[PDB]
Design a protein around this nucleic acid. Sequence first.
DNA 1: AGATTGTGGATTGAGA
DNA 2: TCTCAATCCACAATCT
Length: 120
Amino acid sequence: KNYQRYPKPPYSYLAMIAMVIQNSPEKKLTLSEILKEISTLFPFFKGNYKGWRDSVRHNLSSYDCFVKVLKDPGKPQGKGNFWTVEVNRIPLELLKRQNTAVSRQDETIFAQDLAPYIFQ
DNA sequence: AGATTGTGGATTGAGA
DNA sequence: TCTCAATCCACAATCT
Ligand SMILES: [K+]
């Protein structure tokens, strides 16, 4: 296994997932839809590194703020479910812009905090 | 068959 | 020097 860090946008995966969910019409998205919407946020995600898609999937399950909503309520073991975000479960500091080489390269193109786009 | 989803074991390494 | 978000991977389902 060859671990590598990539020049991803200077926001946590949690923050970006939460932003796309909260800015969707029904405040819920399938994994496939989350991945498509994240890809539109920054050109990085359209590049040839695709492992971020795995990181997003991992994050949905690992953080308690993301709550699966069954696509079919009679199939609790079905997949392709919707995901929601409970903002009162978000660790607020994970919504701040990160201090990384990417943000230091160009601070002005990155909002300092995503909380205004996630909380009502 | 086939591709994706949902969850977790585990290591990595820059920011702090 | 220590934290934990980032990242790579297996597993075991469903999906097709
Ligand atoms: K979760």
